[PDB]
Amino acid sequence: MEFVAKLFKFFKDLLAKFLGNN
Amino acid sequence: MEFVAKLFKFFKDLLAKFLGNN
Amino acid sequence: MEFVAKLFKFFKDLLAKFLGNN
Amino acid sequence: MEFVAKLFKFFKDLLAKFLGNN
Amino acid sequence: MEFVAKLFKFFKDLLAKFLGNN
Amino acid sequence: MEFVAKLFKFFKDLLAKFLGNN
Amino acid sequence: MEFVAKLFKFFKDLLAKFLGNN
Amino acid sequence: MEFVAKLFKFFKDLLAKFLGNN
Amino acid sequence: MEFVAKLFKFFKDLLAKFLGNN
Amino acid sequence: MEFVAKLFKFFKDLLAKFLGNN
Amino acid sequence: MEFVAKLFKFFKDLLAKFLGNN
Amino acid sequence: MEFVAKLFKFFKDLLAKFLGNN
Amino acid sequence: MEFVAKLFKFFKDLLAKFLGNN
Amino acid sequence: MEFVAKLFKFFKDLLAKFLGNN
Amino acid sequence: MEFVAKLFKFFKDLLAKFLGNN
Amino acid sequence: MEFVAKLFKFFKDLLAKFLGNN
Amino acid sequence: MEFVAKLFKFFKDLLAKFLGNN
Amino acid sequence: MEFVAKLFKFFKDLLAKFLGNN
Ligand SMILES: [Cl-]
Ligand SMILES: [Cl-]
Ligand SMILES: [Cl-]
Ligand SMILES: [Cl-]
Ligand SMILES: [Cl-]
Ligand SMILES: [Cl-]
Ligand SMILES: [Cl-]
Ligand SMILES: [Cl-]
Ligand SMILES: [Cl-]
Ligand SMILES: [Cl-]
Ligand SMILES: [Cl-]
Ligand SMILES: [Cl-]
Ligand SMILES: [Cl-]
Ligand SMILES: [Cl-]
Ligand SMILES: [Cl-]
Ligand SMILES: [Cl-]
Ligand SMILES: [Cl-]
Ligand SMILES: [Cl-]
Ligand code: NA
Ligand code: NA
Ligand code: NA
Ligand code: NA
Ligand code: NA
Ligand code: NA
Ligand code: NA
Ligand code: NA
Ligand code: NA
Ligand code: NA
Ligand code: NA
Ligand code: NA
Ligand code: NA
Ligand code: NA
Ligand code: NA
Ligand code: NA
Ligand code: NA
Ligand code: NA
Ligand code: NA
Ligand code: NA
Ligand code: NA
Ligand code: NA
Ligand code: NA
Ligand code: NA
Ligand code: NA
Ligand code: NA
Ligand code: NA
Ligand code: NA
Ligand code: NA
Ligand code: NA
Ligand code: NA
Ligand code: NA
Ligand code: NA
Ligand code: NA
Ligand code: NA
Ligand code: NA
């Protein structure tokens, strides 16, 4: 996975630990 | 998928986590 | 699909997420 | 389909999403 | 401005970003 | 600004970061 | 700033750290 | 695993010892 | 600063120690 | 195990003697 | 300073003793 | 066992004679 | 100074006797 | 056994004659 | 000075008689 | 047995004649 | 001076008669 | 001077008659 996608995924996954899979 | 489409998709998908698949 | 058509389709589809298929 | 016809069709179809097939 | 006019204007303006004011 | 207009503006502005003000 | 706007801004700003203000 | 990913993982795992797997 | 923002800031700042202010 | 990882592990393990495995 | 922040700071400061202020 | 590890182990073991294995 | 901080400081200071203030 | 270890052991053993094996 | 600190200090000072103030 | 060990043993044994084997 | 400290001091001083003040 | 100290002093002084004040 390209770097910008890896980094976007990291923050989206982090937010999901708080708000859920949705 | 071309870059602009990937990026538009990311934001549309992010909005769907809040508002649903609709 | 040509670019202008892709872009028009994107916005029409986005509006449909709010207002329906109609 | 020629470009002007494609473009006229797009707007007529858009109006039909609001007012119907008529 | 009424909604259908706003929406027609949006697409005409979008097309002008590609083809010019003409 | 109404929500659909805000959202259309966001994507048009995003595209302009790649293609210019035009 | 509303939450969805804050979150969209975060990702757009993150992308700008890689690709510039544009 | 690349270094930045190892380091991000360490802090995310540390936070999970306090807040859970979520 | 709200918790999710504090946590996003921490990781963005950590990445900047490696890649710069950009 | 690389030195920085050994050292991080030592402090995390020390904290666990007080706060548990969690 | 809250506990999780104190603990994150400790490890970031420890890493800086090896890699610098950056 | 390397010297710094031997020395850290000595103090951790000494503390355990007072506070337990934990 | 709280006990866990005193104990972390002791080991960090001990390591500095070998590796320097850094 | 190396000299520093012999000497540390002597004092730890001496303390145990007063405080126990623990 | 509390007992555990007195005892840690004794061994650290003993080691310094061999290895220096450092 | 080396001389310093012989001498330490003598005094520890002498103390045990007063305080016991412990 | 407390008894354990007196006794530790005696042995450390005895060792210094052989190895110096250091 | 307490008895155990008197007795330790006697033997240390006796040894000094052979090995010096050191
Ligand atoms: Cl991730
Ligand atoms: Cl996506
Ligand atoms: Cl689309
Ligand atoms: Cl059409
Ligand atoms: Cl417009
Ligand atoms: Cl915008
Ligand atoms: Cl931001
Ligand atoms: Cl980890
Ligand atoms: Cl931060
Ligand atoms: Cl460890
Ligand atoms: Cl710190
Ligand atoms: Cl040990
Ligand atoms: Cl210390
Ligand atoms: Cl011993
Ligand atoms: Cl001391
Ligand atoms: Cl003996
Ligand atoms: Cl003495
Ligand atoms: Cl005497
Ligand atoms: Na992750
Ligand atoms: Na995921
Ligand atoms: Na996505
Ligand atoms: Na999707
Ligand atoms: Na779409
Ligand atoms: Na569609
Ligand atoms: Na159409
Ligand atoms: Na049609
Ligand atoms: Na517009
Ligand atoms: Na216009
Ligand atoms: Na924007
Ligand atoms: Na704009
Ligand atoms: Na930001
Ligand atoms: Na910005
Ligand atoms: Na870890
Ligand atoms: Na994990
Ligand atoms: Na930080
Ligand atoms: Na910052
Ligand atoms: Na350990
Ligand atoms: Na462990
Ligand atoms: Na610190
Ligand atoms: Na610092
Ligand atoms: Na030991
Ligand atoms: Na042990
Ligand atoms: Na210390
Ligand atoms: Na210090
Ligand atoms: Na002994
Ligand atoms: Na022993
Ligand atoms: Na001492
Ligand atoms: Na000292
Ligand atoms: Na004897
Ligand atoms: Na004996
Ligand atoms: Na003495
Ligand atoms: Na002395
Ligand atoms: Na005498
Ligand atoms: Na004397």
Side-chain angles (χ1 to χ4, degrees):
Chain A
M1 182 174 288
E2 68 270 18
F3 190 70
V4 171
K6 281 208 303 213
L7 192 62
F8 274 31
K9 178 181 154 55
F10 171 84
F11 288 108
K12 195 165 34 64
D13 294 346
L14 186 58
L15 184 61
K17 295 297 203 99
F18 292 87
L19 300 192
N21 338 102
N22 298 131
Chain B
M1 182 174 288
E2 68 270 18
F3 190 70
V4 171
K6 281 208 303 213
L7 192 62
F8 274 31
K9 178 181 154 55
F10 171 84
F11 288 108
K12 195 165 34 64
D13 294 346
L14 186 58
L15 184 61
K17 295 297 203 99
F18 292 87
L19 300 192
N21 338 102
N22 298 131
Chain C
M1 182 174 288
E2 68 270 18
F3 190 70
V4 171
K6 281 208 303 213
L7 192 62
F8 274 31
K9 178 181 154 55
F10 171 84
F11 288 108
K12 195 165 34 64
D13 294 346
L14 186 58
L15 184 61
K17 295 297 203 99
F18 292 87
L19 300 192
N21 338 102
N22 298 131
Chain D
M1 182 174 288
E2 68 270 18
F3 190 70
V4 171
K6 281 208 303 213
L7 192 62
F8 274 31
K9 178 181 154 55
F10 171 84
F11 288 108
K12 195 165 34 64
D13 294 346
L14 186 58
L15 184 61
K17 295 297 203 99
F18 292 87
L19 300 192
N21 338 102
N22 298 131
Chain E
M1 182 174 288
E2 68 270 18
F3 190 70
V4 171
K6 281 208 303 213
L7 192 62
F8 274 31
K9 178 181 154 55
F10 171 84
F11 288 108
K12 195 165 34 64
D13 294 346
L14 186 58
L15 184 61
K17 295 297 203 99
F18 292 87
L19 300 192
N21 338 102
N22 298 131
Chain F
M1 182 174 288
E2 68 270 18
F3 190 70
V4 171
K6 281 208 303 213
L7 192 62
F8 274 31
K9 178 181 154 55
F10 171 84
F11 288 108
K12 195 165 34 64
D13 294 346
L14 186 58
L15 184 61
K17 295 297 203 99
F18 292 87
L19 300 192
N21 338 102
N22 298 131
Chain G
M1 182 174 288
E2 68 270 18
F3 190 70
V4 171
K6 281 208 303 213
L7 192 62
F8 274 31
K9 178 181 154 55
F10 171 84
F11 288 108
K12 195 165 34 64
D13 294 346
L14 186 58
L15 184 61
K17 295 297 203 99
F18 292 87
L19 300 192
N21 338 102
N22 298 131
Chain H
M1 182 174 288
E2 68 270 18
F3 190 70
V4 171
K6 281 208 303 213
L7 192 62
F8 274 31
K9 178 181 154 55
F10 171 84
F11 288 108
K12 195 165 34 64
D13 294 346
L14 186 58
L15 184 61
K17 295 297 203 99
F18 292 87
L19 300 192
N21 338 102
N22 298 131
Chain I
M1 182 174 288
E2 68 270 18
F3 190 70
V4 171
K6 281 208 303 213
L7 192 62
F8 274 31
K9 178 181 154 55
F10 171 84
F11 288 108
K12 195 165 34 64
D13 294 346
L14 186 58
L15 184 61
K17 295 297 203 99
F18 292 87
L19 300 192
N21 338 102
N22 298 131
Chain J
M1 182 174 288
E2 68 270 18
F3 190 70
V4 171
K6 281 208 303 213
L7 192 62
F8 274 31
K9 178 181 154 55
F10 171 84
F11 288 108
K12 195 165 34 64
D13 294 346
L14 186 58
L15 184 61
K17 295 297 203 99
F18 292 87
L19 300 192
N21 338 102
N22 298 131
Chain K
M1 182 174 288
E2 68 270 18
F3 190 70
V4 171
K6 281 208 303 213
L7 192 62
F8 274 31
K9 178 181 154 55
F10 171 84
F11 288 108
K12 195 165 34 64
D13 294 346
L14 186 58
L15 184 61
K17 295 297 203 99
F18 292 87
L19 300 192
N21 338 102
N22 298 131
Chain L
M1 182 174 288
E2 68 270 18
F3 190 70
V4 171
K6 281 208 303 213
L7 192 62
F8 274 31
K9 178 181 154 55
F10 171 84
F11 288 108
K12 195 165 34 64
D13 294 346
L14 186 58
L15 184 61
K17 295 297 203 99
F18 292 87
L19 300 192
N21 338 102
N22 298 131
Chain M
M1 182 174 288
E2 68 270 18
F3 190 70
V4 171
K6 281 208 303 213
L7 192 62
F8 274 31
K9 178 181 154 55
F10 171 84
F11 288 108
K12 195 165 34 64
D13 294 346
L14 186 58
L15 184 61
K17 295 297 203 99
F18 292 87
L19 300 192
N21 338 102
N22 298 131
Chain N
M1 182 174 288
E2 68 270 18
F3 190 70
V4 171
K6 281 208 303 213
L7 192 62
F8 274 31
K9 178 181 154 55
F10 171 84
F11 288 108
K12 195 165 34 64
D13 294 346
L14 186 58
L15 184 61
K17 295 297 203 99
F18 292 87
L19 300 192
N21 338 102
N22 298 131
Chain O
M1 182 174 288
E2 68 270 18
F3 190 70
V4 171
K6 281 208 303 213
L7 192 62
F8 274 31
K9 178 181 154 55
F10 171 84
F11 288 108
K12 195 165 34 64
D13 294 346
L14 186 58
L15 184 61
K17 295 297 203 99
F18 292 87
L19 300 192
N21 338 102
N22 298 131
Chain P
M1 182 174 288
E2 68 270 18
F3 190 70
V4 171
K6 281 208 303 213
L7 192 62
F8 274 31
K9 178 181 154 55
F10 171 84
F11 288 108
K12 195 165 34 64
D13 294 346
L14 186 58
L15 184 61
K17 295 297 203 99
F18 292 87
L19 300 192
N21 338 102
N22 298 131
Chain Q
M1 182 174 288
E2 68 270 18
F3 190 70
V4 171
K6 281 208 303 213
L7 192 62
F8 274 31
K9 178 181 154 55
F10 171 84
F11 288 108
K12 195 165 34 64
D13 294 346
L14 186 58
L15 184 61
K17 295 297 203 99
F18 292 87
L19 300 192
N21 338 102
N22 298 131
Chain R
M1 182 174 288
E2 68 270 18
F3 190 70
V4 171
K6 281 208 303 213
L7 192 62
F8 274 31
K9 178 181 154 55
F10 171 84
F11 288 108
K12 195 165 34 64
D13 294 346
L14 186 58
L15 184 61
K17 295 297 203 99
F18 292 87
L19 300 192
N21 338 102
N22 298 131

